[PDB]
Ligand binder design. Structure first.
Ligand code: DB5
Lengths: 225, 227
């Protein structure tokens, strides 16, 4: 595709999230860069409103699947780069088992040379002193295949997948993800055959950063064809 | 500790493993470097005998907890660096649920300026078309925080923990780990209060390497004590 040409080389990234979980309002801003040729992303996120009222790991999935490395024989199945530069809308419902739900809506698009992810997040029905609002999750992120399928009727894609957040006592907090993406622009996009994305993620801290924050390194590849 | 002084800066690492799984002998050699100040390890491992007869992810835990980043308030709980340069013995039993068992014995010590992990591994009772010998595990590595306790009777530490390996069909292969570490030398070591290590790992391939191999990037930190 012509949109793929925008991801040769290193691309700067900006992420903006405005959030409300059980009435706790917050904002996150992230910056960094992406190298789709190697499937590599490096970002630093800051909570600009003070302390994050939820664990950082619970926002990883919400906080740019266009930086996935598609091998040569699968280039024609890359919807995400296909929609660029005009971009796509990404919406999810994330259901935390025995706890609350996030609903997210993002626009992912180029603004000049920068790939921008602007997100609104609303969370409801979280338990005070549950794993989320009680901050009981380990600072890490487990890797599992995310299966992508075409959504012909919306000219886009969908995905449903399960994230398992490790809990401080050795238990597991399931977060069921339901995802739909659709192009912002008109003009042709690539609708894929079934395949998957695989991401390996490292969460860390900048020792000089005083604000509540997350440093994130990811390596993402597509396979399954 | 005085041994922690050896881990300011970047330290070269050598890993040597001699293995026998169900009678199938193999060897692995790894090289790279560790930066305990940032909890960062980068290594490349090669199977020097040809094709690895087990999946690479099953050897991750066997293939240097002395590179963990202990924060300032927890420095007195770092047994691993405390035993250096003379080092420690690290022994495990790894039970693969409904499958075989690895038994490992390693020495982790300085030889000159290089931190060296030399390991012998014996594996028994594996199923020939089970997840291990049948190569059915995904090329990745998920982990939970590993809880460390003192083992005062051995002047060292122990840990018991679970690794869950993703299987190609969507199932999970559990590997139950039992670990004991004891110092090689006679000098004083640090015996910790209960805490945990958190390791996050990325597995990859070097596109120019022709041998069967694993590139490994890890970030490791200690936490779980307030003070
Ligand atoms: C903690 O044990 O996490 C496990 C949960 C069960 C196995 C499948 C989900 C998984 C795990 N690790 N990462 N994903």
């Amino acid at each position: 595709s012509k949109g793929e040409e925008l991801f040769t080389g290193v691309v700067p990234i900006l992420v903006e999230l405005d959030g409300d979980v059980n009435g706790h309002k917050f904002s996150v801003r992230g910056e960094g860069e992406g190298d789709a040729t190697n499937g590599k992303l490096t970002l630093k996120f800051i909570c600009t409103t003070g302390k994050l009222p939820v664990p950082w790991p619970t926002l990883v999935t919400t906080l740019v699947q266009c930086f996935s490395r598609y091998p040569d024989h699968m280039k024609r199945h890359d919807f995400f780069k296909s929609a660029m530069p005009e971009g796509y809308v990404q919406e999810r419902t994330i259901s935390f088992k025995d706890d609350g739900t996030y609903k997210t809506r993002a626009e992912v698009k180029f603004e000049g040379d920068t790939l921008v992810n602007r997100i609104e997040l609303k969370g409801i029905d979280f338990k005070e002193d549950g794993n989320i609002l009680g901050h009981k999750l380990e600072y890490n992120f487990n890797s599992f295949n995310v299966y992508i399928t075409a959504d012909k009727q919306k000219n886009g894609i969908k995905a449903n997948f399960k994230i398992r957040h490790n809990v401080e006592d050795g238990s597991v907090q399931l977060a069921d993800h339901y995802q739909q993406n659709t192009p912002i622009g008109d003009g042709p996009v690539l609708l894929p055959d079934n395949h998957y994305l695989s991401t390996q993620s490292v969460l860390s801290k900048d020792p000089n950063e005083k604000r509540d924050h997350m440093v994130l390194l990811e390596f993402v590849t597509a396979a399954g064809i």
